[PDB]
Enzyme design. Structure first.
Site: not given
Ligand SMILES: O=C(O)[C@H]1NC(=O)[C@H](O)[C@@H](O)[C@@H]1O
Ligand SMILES: O=C(O)[C@H]1NC(=O)[C@H](O)[C@@H](O)[C@@H]1O
Lengths: 577, 576
Positions: A166, A398, A454, A458, A492, A537
């Site tokens: 990403d 990851e 996340y 997500y 993150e 993040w």
């Molecule tokens: O979705 C994201 O925003 C982030 N999540 C991740 O799991 C990645 O390790 C990142 O690079 C990515 O930018």
């Protein structure tokens, strides 16, 4: 290994000349440059800044999105006084892969776009004359080199990069370039390792030279006074009343490495180092024998127009912002950064998790992949090991971790990493959600575990954020029940957040939702003793590939891309104080 | 000048080493540095990028807004081989004024923040050793130096800059810094002037050296082939079938200036030049004897975080954007830019109006005049050999309606003429209060530059129809004067917030920027003697904060990060 990773310096024995500036540049869509004598000069070049990513200067899509072979050229005058020294071209990086030519001769090739490329031009250099350097670069993505991706071919014969990661596929000569002169017998590498003994400290060292002459090692304090001296390529420096390099309170000694010829000096290398230990004890991360909780961000090398192009100005602003948030740490997501970033972290007392570009790893192309992965690991650690700021290696972001062959693969990587780090500092990797506690087979390799999560973005975002929290606590409860007795660090967590999008009640993408999401995550973090760090993040909005899920890149920044704080930045500042 | 303005090069005779990077830096609010020996090293420095403006790195107001004395320091190793050369520190600029120290010794001081500062360290430099450079800088504004402003003192004694000009008071070491070595007898200056002779050209030249030995001058074509050679510090190069430097179609020869003593060459200076002529004939601007209509922008040296800090990346993006709009010209509003901008204009075939920082304009005027003429001398001496530079702008909106102003500017234009070997067109930008009935200075100009905001500051928005009427009224007055000179609009524009859309348009919306421009174009196109249009501004840029500036000036056609607003395509289509 067949060259030095040491940062270039200038003194009585070593010379350096910057090749930064405007280079000549030409796209090579037909891949005919190597077949048409472009190594002797580009036929129809335009100007290109170095250091910079080339993509964002242009006004046409096909230029910005260019994928394939492309070329850089410049000319430089070499002082006559460099005659018969060991003369090297040194690129901070060449992204992603390339071949270096000098005066029409192939010198070296390199695979891996985020670490130095050293080209020995001793036999082709022309002292007291104008010299020419030409670099063939390629920025395609594949599954046998890092970071991984694919290359798509349009029916028009045009290539497009298809990342498995990403971030935008920036490329070119993104870091400073030098031409340097070294003595025929020189200091090629050294390593330092530290022990604390009451009020005193020991600096254990190893020196590698390209010859057999005696080595003297000196340590100077911050005022340049001698505090320790020793003889030999291997030894210990004893430092009385050592002033330790502390978190956000740096102190730097200067190591001086001399190659002697009896009366005379053959070579001298100097570098600032910081006396500090890092150790994992149970679920605690210890710096100088005291627990530290990591607070900070994943970053990127990313800035408007320059792309990943290095500039000290970006370093200065980012560190002022980091300090303003009361952070103490960042991870070099998802690749080693320009060396200058670490130099400055040394000065500012910041902790760095240094990460190899092993991202996008989700057949018989794996043995080759493993070779590149290990090579990048070797180069990263050899380059960065003597920075006091570097306190951990991140050896993946990851990957697949739930199979047997995944295990054997990463065992090789960690084994390699262990052999190259003189300090044997903590090694880790960032796991994504699908690395379930019940399924993951690689977390035992890690000194501490990094999670990218996340929950609330997500998974179960927005109206479901309470469900998100429960799912989060459920996973953490499962980790807890495993009693692994290692620290966990969240590397993150974040929400895309459009600056100026306000809503009451909050919605996903609003500034208010970023705050509420962070608060929920903190509540969860704070519920588990073994959590020992939180790196949000991202530090700042950054460029990605275009698509229906990215509104002008990634907006999970706590700062905007031009480095101004969203509402959530204050949340971190208050919490980390 | 007691120094050379020539851009540094590296060859057998001349060496250069870049000092760009992270310097040490310390604010000096109590003005104690010199009395504390800071020239021998800063006691408690932080790191500061060079080149950059210091202001936008910090997170505290008092740092960003710092006004007064502040210091820079760095160290550098000098190669032993530089022994016996003339060794100089060369700062692209030092903003606004400063004193250079080297190895603890005062070398030189300079007033004026947008032109090179040369410091001869020959006598204090230590070849084969680490050397130290320390610069004391001051960024206050006054009425005896350019650009003009005031300094306010708050009750606690804290200083605040108060510009009389509409841009942020960025300062520091904003351009590249080098240490260089020259031969003891060197080329110090040269000037070229061109004449077109059918298919051939003449390059008339003069060379200034720091010695008495013979000079040889060669001209090489773009491939490096010799096309002309002659002897003497004054001379003429005859070029058969000259390939002229053309608008948006550059061709650059390379002049080569050699000093020789008969055991061989002592010095060699090389620089790219372009054979072109510029003149005003009636209401036409003639480039190589053909009329040219100027199309482009006023710019600024301005970019996020770096401030006015020089970067080739900014140059590259800006020229790609300029070409995409089909522009052919920009003005260096409101100060000379880094030399690299002109070098690139030379290669891209852009026309430049080069402007001295006489913006923001009693017993203080004689001092101001001296500063203004000094800056003019430095600018012209630095920039005269760029084919891109087709005109000098000697002011931006000064008072022009009094006899006093006339006498003042008479001296400035006289001085500029003496400094420019080419005697190229000279001008200045006039504000509206310089009424056709009242202005006494426009006769000094070879062509007239107007800044006008009919439809923004005057009768904007619902009154734009009146604005157009007022605009035509003023232009009718200029027309009836029949001055028989070209008029160039050097400013016109509207603050425009990216993303602010409205139907019908409102002031500050993207649509209003389009409509404003269309109205201005209708007016320009109504008068034969209008020969150029440079929009204000190429890009949004930083200003002093206030109730009239929403994060700086938003009259950009591009955003500060260099992306087009809707009006960008209006220019593209019209200029195509
Ligand atoms: O979705 C994201 O925003 C982030 N999540 C991740 O799991 C990645 O390790 C990142 O690079 C990515 O930018
Ligand atoms: O108001 C403006 O936006 C501009 N008008 C002017 O008349 C000035 O010459 C510029 O500096 C200023 O930025």
């Amino acid at each position: 290994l067949e060259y030095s990773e040491l940062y270039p310096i200038q003194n009585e024995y070593r010379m350096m000349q910057s090749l930064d500036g405007m280079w000549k540049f030409q796209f090579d869509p037909e891949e005919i440059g190597k077949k048409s004598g472009w190594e002797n000069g580009l036929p129809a070049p335009v100007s290109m800044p170095v250091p910079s990513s080339f993509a964002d200067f242009f006004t046409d899509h096909k230029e910005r999105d260019y994928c394939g072979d492309f070329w850089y050229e410049t000319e430089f005058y070499l002082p006559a006084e460099w005659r018969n020294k060991k003369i090297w071209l040194r690129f901070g990086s060449i992204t992603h892969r390339g071949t270096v030519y000098c005066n029409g001769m192939e010198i070296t090739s390199h695979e891996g776009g985020f670490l130095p490329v050293l080209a020995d031009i001793s036999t082709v250099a022309k002292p007291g004359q104008v010299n020419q350097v030409v670099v063939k670069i390629n920025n395609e993505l594949n599954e046998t080199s890092l970071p991984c991706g694919a290359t798509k071919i349009l029916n028009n014969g045009r290539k497009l990069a298809k990342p498995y990661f990403d971030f935008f596929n920036y490329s070119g000569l993104q870091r400073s370039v030098w031409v340097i002169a070294l003595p025929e017998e020189s200091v090629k590498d050294y390593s330092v390792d530290y022990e604390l003994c009451g009020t005193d400290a020991l600096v254990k060292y190893e020196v590698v030279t390209t010859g057999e002459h005696p080595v003297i090692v000196r340590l100077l304090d911050a005022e340049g006074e001698l505090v320790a001296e020793t003889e030999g390529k291997e030894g210990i420096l004893q430092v009385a009343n050592a002033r330790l390099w502390e978190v956000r309170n740096a102190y730097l000694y200067q190591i001086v490495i001399l190659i002697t010829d009896g009366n005379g000096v053959l070579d001298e290398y100097r570098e600032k180092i910081g006396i500090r230990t890092v150790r994992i004890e149970g679920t605690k991360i210890l710096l100088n024998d005291r627990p530290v909780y990591l607070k900070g961000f994943g970053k990127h090398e990313d800035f408007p127009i320059l792309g990943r192009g290095f500039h000290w100005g970006i370093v200065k602003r980012d560190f002022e912002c980091l300090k303003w948030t009361n952070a103490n740490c960042f991870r070099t997501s998802h690749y080693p950064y320009a060396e200058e970033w670490y130099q400055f972290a040394d000065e500012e007392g910041f902790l760095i998790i240094d990460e190899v570009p092993a991202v996008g790893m989700m057949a018989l192309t794996v043995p080759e992949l493993l070779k590149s992965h290990i090579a990048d690991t070797e180069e990263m650690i050899t380059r960065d090991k003597n920075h006091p700021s570097v306190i951990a290696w991140s050896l993946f972001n990851e990957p697949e971790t739930i199979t047997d062959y995944a295990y054997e693969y990463f065992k090789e990587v960690f084994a390699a990493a262990e052999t190259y780090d003189f300090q044997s500092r903590p090694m880790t990797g960032a796991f994504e959600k699908n690395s379930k506690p019940e399924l993951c087979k690689c977390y035992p390799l890690c000194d501490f575990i990094c999670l990218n999560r996340y929950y609330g973005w997500y998974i179960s975002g927005g109206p479901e954020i309470e469900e998100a929290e429960e799912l989060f606590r459920d996973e953490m409860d499962r980790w807890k029940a495993k009693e692994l007795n290692v620290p966990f660090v969240f590397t993150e967590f974040g929400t895309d957040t459009m600056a100026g999008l306000h809503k009451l009640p909050s919605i996903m993408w609003s500034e208010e939702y970023q705050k509420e999401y962070l608060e929920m995550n903190f509540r969860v973090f704070d519920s588990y003793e073994f959590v020992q760090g939180e790196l949000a993040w991202n530090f700042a909005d950054f460029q990605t590939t275009e698509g229906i899920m990215r509104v002008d890149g990634n907006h999970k920044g706590v700062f905007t891309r031009d480095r101004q704080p969203k509402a959530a930045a204050v949340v971190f500042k208050d919490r980390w104080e």
